[PDB]
Amino acid sequence: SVDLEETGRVLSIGDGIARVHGLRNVQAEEMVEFSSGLKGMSLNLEPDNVGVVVFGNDKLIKEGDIVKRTGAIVDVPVGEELLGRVVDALGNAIDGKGPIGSKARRRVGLKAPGIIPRISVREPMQTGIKAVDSLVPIGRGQRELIIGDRQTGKTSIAIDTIINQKRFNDGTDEKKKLYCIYVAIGQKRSTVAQLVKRLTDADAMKYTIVVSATASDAAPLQYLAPYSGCSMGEYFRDNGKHALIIYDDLSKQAVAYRQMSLLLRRPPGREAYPGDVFYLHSRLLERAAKMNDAFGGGSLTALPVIETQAGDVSAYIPTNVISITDGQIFLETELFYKGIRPAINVGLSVSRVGSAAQTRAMKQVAGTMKLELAQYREVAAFAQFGSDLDAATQQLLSRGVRLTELLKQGQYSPMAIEEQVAVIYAGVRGYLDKLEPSKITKFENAFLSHVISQHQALLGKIRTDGKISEESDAKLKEIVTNFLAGFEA
Amino acid sequence: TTGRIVAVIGAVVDVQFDEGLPPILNALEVQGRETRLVLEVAQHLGESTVRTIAMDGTEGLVRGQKVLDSGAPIRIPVGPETLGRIMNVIGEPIDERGPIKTKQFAAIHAEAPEFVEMSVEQEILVTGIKVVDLLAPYAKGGKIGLFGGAGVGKTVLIMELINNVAKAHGGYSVFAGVGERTREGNDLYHEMIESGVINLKDATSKVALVYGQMNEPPGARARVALTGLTVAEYFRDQEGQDVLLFIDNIFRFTQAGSEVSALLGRIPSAVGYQPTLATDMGTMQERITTTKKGSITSVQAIYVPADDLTDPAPATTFAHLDATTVLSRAIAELGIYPAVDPLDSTSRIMDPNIVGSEHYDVARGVQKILQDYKSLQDILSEEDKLTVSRARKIQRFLSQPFQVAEVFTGHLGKLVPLKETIKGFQQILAGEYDHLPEQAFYMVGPIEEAVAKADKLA
Amino acid sequence: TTGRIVAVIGAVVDVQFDEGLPPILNALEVQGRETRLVLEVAQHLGESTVRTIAMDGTEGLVRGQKVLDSGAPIRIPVGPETLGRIMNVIGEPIDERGPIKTKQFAAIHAEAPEFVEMSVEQEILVTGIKVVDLLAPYAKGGKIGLFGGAGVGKTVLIMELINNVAKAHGGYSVFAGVGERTREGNDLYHEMIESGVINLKDATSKVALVYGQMNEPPGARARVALTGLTVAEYFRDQEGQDVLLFIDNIFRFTQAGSEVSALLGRIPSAVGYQPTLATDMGTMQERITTTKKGSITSVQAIYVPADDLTDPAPATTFAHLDATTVLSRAIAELGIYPAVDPLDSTSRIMDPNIVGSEHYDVARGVQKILQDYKSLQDIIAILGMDELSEEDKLTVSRARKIQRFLSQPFQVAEVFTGHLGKLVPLKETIKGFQQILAGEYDHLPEQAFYMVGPIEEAVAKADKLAE
Ligand SMILES: Nc1ncnc2c1ncn2[C@@H]1O[C@H](COP(=O)(O)OP(=O)(O)NP(=O)(O)O)[C@@H](O)[C@H]1O
Ligand SMILES: Nc1ncnc2c1ncn2[C@@H]1O[C@H](COP(=O)(O)OP(=O)(O)NP(=O)(O)O)[C@@H](O)[C@H]1O
Ligand SMILES: [Cl-]
Ligand SMILES: [Mg+2]
Ligand SMILES: [Mg+2]
């Protein structure tokens, strides 16, 4: 006898696609098990066969190999036991620190919450980077796209954001605590090894879950890896807490999914991607959400990554994830080598949530700074080609170059909100207007060490009062003008 | 009768029948599902089998699962009970307030009005807004391109158009979220509640909401515009109203169509778009028109890909647009509300034959003097200095406080009728309020309040 | 078990088996051939049939011709007896010095090192090339990639790295000649015999050559990259030694895949490539790495079709690399050799915590003055030099001198330049670009910085140009 309903046999195998005879009772996207131990997801249910994508090296799958159902729920472990563990696409540990002691589990493929379970994004998500928190502000629940060419600083923004959460997670306030999930799709292992070392060095791993589907892992593991990590973040969101997820990157995930769609012979569209590639990324990103009090009050915040090619933000996959997300942080190559680091384009970068994800301290100085940079960016094209310029434009050109230099920042040193507003305030009220533009980054680095060291009580005032008061205005005015004359000598 | 699923590939389900096959565009209910799964028919493949496009996720489906022919297209609840309610592409309520208790069930796939039904009259939908009615007026049964991103009072402009058209013309509105961001679906719903255009406690709701969210498959976002269009077709045909249909976003209607066409195996056209791009647009847009019963005017959110107007998506859509409403950040940052660019925003019905003679000449003077001001900003004589004072006052008088933004701002909202807008800007160009100061014109209803503001502050 | 050939279309050969069907990756030996002809099983088509790709030319093959299965993938010679010898894709000598005298063989297909095996050391490896050391320096036990279009100096650079780094090196080396010029294989082979890096008599040879050049069919070029790294994998793990793994050109691995992809029955991906580009690159590139058990410093030449770095092949390669040296035709066109793009080449170790702040601050200062100059070039070509500020035309003059001081005459490139080869130490590189940034040579002319080693030679050459 032969059971062709619950089991089947391989007709053809190649390029990680196994066509399977029988398997009449299998469901769509159901995980089946091959004879050699390897798993496989049933993506194409056709009349004469099942198109099964292979989860691993396909030399172990041959012709006439028995494919079996096991009623396998496609899920990954979730909880607080994953915190500080480096795991693969299915939540198996790859750090060699024993097993995961997980209790609960959640399906990788689930719908997002609808309209009713959410509430508007009120709680700010602090990155630590000044250009982001002031001009491109992100909120808990929001989905902010990090986008740019190769080697423009895309991951660095995600890393500093994770490192910035240590102060909240070490503090007593449970509302501000933000757990983190880094997801690596298509990267090499030595890059992820350096990335976990970076986080461990900053004591960040004790709250961070690292999901990693690397280049050697099969395409279906890269295809699932973002969804697996998304389910891990949803548990925190559902059970009251707040979460942050980084997809690094969705470009490489799309390539993995394209490989499967082309070898399953689904119709190739623009750039050879299938028609459901938007459906792919929109399913993922929509699951990040700000919940209301009734369902929990928690949140999941998405920071997806998209690698552009020659700055072409109009390319198919970038066009998708831009329109899905709530805002974009555009990184450019010309800005990076100009000295603008992080190399964020202020004019084009946007947060549609905006002020609603900011504190009153930041909201005071950010609106003023944003306006003056807009006045600069129009006039800046004839900054050098001017010379005989009137005092109106010379004020905008001077002030604008000063403020741009304050947006520059060091890597691996994310700042508290009270430290940022003090630095921006110096630019806005114009105490640095006569200082040499080239020496602002160095001026700021020493000034920051000075105000942290000596004036620790002054930073307490700005955080308590929720603004720079008239007392702080006068107190900070003395600290700048004296330091300015001492530094430039 | 009950047909069997013979293939499932992503969101493309093949269904075999025996006795009688369903026609194209028919809705098929899948039996043995917890949530409702509609499959819209697309192609008769042959040998008693049809190809369908699924309106929801196909995970869990087995080969041989029971699929029942409804015997018609996707039929959805229509009536006055839809006002104040949110429904999906297939008519189900997604606001969690129970079933939508209407006494009619209209099909979403409906033929456009015949040539005999067409209204040759070039009427003008009086919006109430000063920037719109003067310079870029909305034609009845026409389409308008709503340009500019979010954060410039886009959702506020929508709500006021719902508010003002429901008051004067007695016509309700419809919002079709074609690829709605579920977060922004939440924000638009609750902002409409707090303003007053939606009412949760009594039945004074001025909008029906129809969301086809981004996480739904291509079949959903493709047809959700037709669902909301059908809700508007009830108010026009059955009750003779001049209806509004807000589509956001029209590029996502084009995009969803390009996804569906790809999934079915059709070979793409130029720039990757579906070969049926003009027809997919045309079959939708021709229903948005005037008839003898009433009209369906439509504000449509235009996204221009790659900032290229000559791209297939915008080019094909501009064939249908009768006007444009260009929102701007440069206009917003100068304190003007609404944030409409007066020179960029234009209309086809802006014509001395169509609208009034006094309408066309006065509006032409505003278009002339505002450009003359923009020339002088680069830098005067008696005529040059006189135009600079008037043009600034024209920029102030274009601003208006909205009824939607009362709890938002504090200032009272004012609906300005048509001829008040003609007379107001005419007296400024003629030079009757050259004596009065500039700040009186900022944030006012008609010109009577500007004079009343000058009489009080004196 | 015995099978029979059923189809032959170019390099792709289908084989049918009555009883024992061989698995994927297994080498099948073709009978009735004078020379040895391997066919690696790529796919299983069904109906007791498998699709294979040929490691040599298919001319002469007949339908119904017998094919035996080895019961294993392509197994090649590994061990210190490979040193001094030239191998091909299937592990045979192509140097005419008897058999490879070893009794231990390793399969060319193998799983890449796990995540726990990864290392995080990254100390600098000073090449002696100014542009590389200054702006985007390489690391010991790290992955290095030399990008570039057709004829911009990838091979000239990789040979100079062999000249500078590999000769003064205690451990072994492996040069994997993947799909490039047989002439260049001859040039290298006899140049290493001259320098004593290969020795034909005693067993003191440091480098083990592996070659599958553009005279070979796609199966050879698609796998000879793997063959070469399997030799390096033995020297990594089993020995415990610092291996240098040079590859020229690793694009050809991916190119060879694209040539047969059509005939394997696949829908093409963007720009005519196979759908399995990144996954095929991944299982290969992840093996080329440093682990706990041993350190590999891997230099890979990377071809860029039509000079377009966005091309799927080179675009995918970037992520696999710790340091990248991107070459440009635009820069080579002006005589600037090595034609490295200073505003495109990058490294992981370019950090003030790794290479010190004095190095870092000069490297960014060079990138800034060059990047600021790049924007000006197009504006001041039309509107003229005299419209610039005195601050600008200072940064224009300095930039043009800095561009020229990034150029350098290589020893391997002496036949093209006409100048003597020079190696510049890292200390004198940093000081050289420090002084030019500060304006210490604004008085000196432009052409004195072009094609010289240290900053001292510019001062001497500047006096020579006086008369
Ligand atoms: N704010 C900063 N200041 C100084 N250096 C920076 C900053 N941000 C990034 N870098 C450097 O820029 C390089 C690239 O940063 P990275 O975050 O890897 O960008 P990426 O685009 O994600 N890289 P890839 O994934 O390979 O395309 C690294 O060497 C960083 O050290
Ligand atoms: N550093 C250099 N100094 C002087 N001449 C050079 C240098 N680099 C390249 N050239 C010249 O340009 C030629 C091309 O160099 P080569 O290294 O063969 O380029 P390639 O990028 O390897 N070409 P291919 O492998 O065909 O894509 C050399 O043979 C020289 O004539
Ligand atoms: Cl240093
Ligand atoms: Mg990165
Ligand atoms: Mg070469």
Short mmCIF file of C-alpha atoms in Angstrom, two decimals, chain A residues 22-29 43-50 111-121 142-143 266-270 275-276 278-279 282-283 286 314 316 319 322-326 352-353 370-371 374, chain B residues 6-11 35 56-63 86 94-96 150-151 180-187 189-190 211 213-218 221 251-252 255 259 262-265 268 271-272 303 305-306 333:
data_model
loop_
_atom_site.label_atom_id
_atom_site.label_comp_id
_atom_site.label_asym_id
_atom_site.label_seq_id
_atom_site.Cartn_x
_atom_site.Cartn_y
_atom_site.Cartn_z
CA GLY A 22 0.93 12.98 -3.87
CA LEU A 23 0.48 15.00 -0.65
CA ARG A 24 -3.21 15.66 -1.39
CA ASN A 25 -4.11 16.78 2.17
CA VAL A 26 -1.26 19.36 2.56
CA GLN A 27 -2.10 23.02 3.19
CA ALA A 28 -0.66 26.15 1.57
CA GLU A 29 2.61 27.35 3.18
CA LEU A 43 4.47 27.20 -1.58
CA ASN A 44 2.98 25.90 -4.86
CA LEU A 45 0.00 23.54 -4.64
CA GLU A 46 -0.54 22.45 -8.27
CA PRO A 47 -2.84 19.69 -9.66
CA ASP A 48 -0.12 17.11 -10.44
CA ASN A 49 2.46 18.08 -7.74
CA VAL A 50 3.48 20.18 -4.71
CA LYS A 111 -1.87 39.09 10.43
CA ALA A 112 -1.23 42.53 11.90
CA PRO A 113 -3.68 44.20 14.31
CA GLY A 114 -6.50 46.04 12.49
CA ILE A 115 -7.75 49.61 12.92
CA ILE A 116 -9.39 49.27 16.36
CA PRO A 117 -6.61 47.69 18.53
CA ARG A 118 -4.21 50.63 17.87
CA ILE A 119 -3.87 54.23 19.09
CA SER A 120 -1.88 57.16 17.59
CA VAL A 121 1.90 57.17 18.14
CA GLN A 142 6.16 53.82 14.03
CA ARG A 143 8.00 52.23 11.11
CA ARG A 266 5.84 32.25 -10.94
CA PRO A 267 5.61 35.19 -13.37
CA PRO A 268 8.61 37.60 -13.29
CA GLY A 269 7.69 41.31 -13.19
CA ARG A 270 9.86 44.43 -12.87
CA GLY A 275 3.68 40.36 -8.12
CA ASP A 276 3.37 39.66 -4.36
CA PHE A 278 4.79 44.41 -2.01
CA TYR A 279 2.33 42.03 -0.30
CA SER A 282 3.62 45.19 3.70
CA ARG A 283 2.56 42.04 5.63
CA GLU A 286 2.20 46.46 9.24
CA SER A 314 12.76 54.85 -7.49
CA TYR A 316 11.15 48.60 -7.48
CA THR A 319 9.65 52.15 -4.07
CA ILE A 322 9.20 53.78 1.12
CA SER A 323 5.41 53.85 0.50
CA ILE A 324 4.70 51.23 3.23
CA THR A 325 6.67 52.95 6.01
CA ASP A 326 5.77 56.00 8.13
CA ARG A 352 5.05 61.63 9.05
CA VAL A 353 4.42 61.15 12.80
CA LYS A 370 14.09 72.85 10.92
CA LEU A 371 12.90 76.25 9.61
CA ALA A 374 15.06 75.17 5.05
CA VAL B 6 -7.42 22.38 -7.96
CA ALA B 7 -4.41 24.70 -7.42
CA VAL B 8 -3.09 27.30 -4.92
CA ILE B 9 -0.09 29.46 -5.93
CA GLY B 10 0.33 32.45 -3.57
CA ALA B 11 -2.86 34.52 -3.93
CA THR B 35 -12.68 34.04 8.65
CA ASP B 56 -7.37 37.51 1.68
CA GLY B 57 -4.45 35.22 2.63
CA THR B 58 -4.50 31.68 1.20
CA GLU B 59 -2.53 29.96 4.01
CA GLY B 60 -4.32 26.78 5.21
CA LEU B 61 -6.09 25.92 1.92
CA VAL B 62 -6.03 22.26 0.79
CA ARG B 63 -6.40 20.91 -2.76
CA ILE B 86 -15.74 51.23 8.15
CA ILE B 94 -13.88 46.21 10.35
CA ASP B 95 -14.70 48.87 13.01
CA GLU B 96 -16.28 46.23 15.34
CA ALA B 150 1.14 64.68 4.53
CA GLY B 151 1.73 67.27 7.26
CA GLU B 180 -4.35 52.40 3.57
CA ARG B 181 -1.57 52.41 6.18
CA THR B 182 -3.36 50.76 9.14
CA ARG B 183 -1.79 53.31 11.54
CA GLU B 184 -3.11 56.21 9.39
CA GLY B 185 -6.48 54.42 9.04
CA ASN B 186 -6.68 54.70 12.84
CA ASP B 187 -5.73 58.41 12.81
CA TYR B 189 -11.06 57.55 11.73
CA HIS B 190 -10.58 59.20 15.15
CA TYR B 211 -10.31 50.52 3.81
CA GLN B 213 -5.07 48.10 3.84
CA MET B 214 -1.50 47.52 2.60
CA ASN B 215 -1.03 44.15 4.33
CA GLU B 216 -3.98 42.71 2.29
CA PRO B 217 -3.26 40.92 -1.05
CA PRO B 218 -3.24 42.56 -4.55
CA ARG B 221 -6.23 46.83 -3.01
CA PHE B 251 -1.17 55.38 -7.66
CA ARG B 252 -1.80 52.44 -5.30
CA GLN B 255 0.10 49.63 -8.40
CA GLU B 259 0.53 43.35 -9.08
CA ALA B 262 1.67 40.08 -12.90
CA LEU B 263 0.28 37.29 -10.66
CA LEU B 264 -2.09 36.08 -13.41
CA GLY B 265 0.89 35.70 -15.79
CA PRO B 268 4.09 43.58 -18.53
CA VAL B 271 8.01 50.59 -17.09
CA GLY B 272 6.62 47.30 -15.67
CA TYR B 303 1.60 60.12 -6.08
CA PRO B 305 6.74 58.13 -9.07
CA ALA B 306 10.36 59.33 -9.55
CA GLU B 333 5.50 77.69 6.54
#
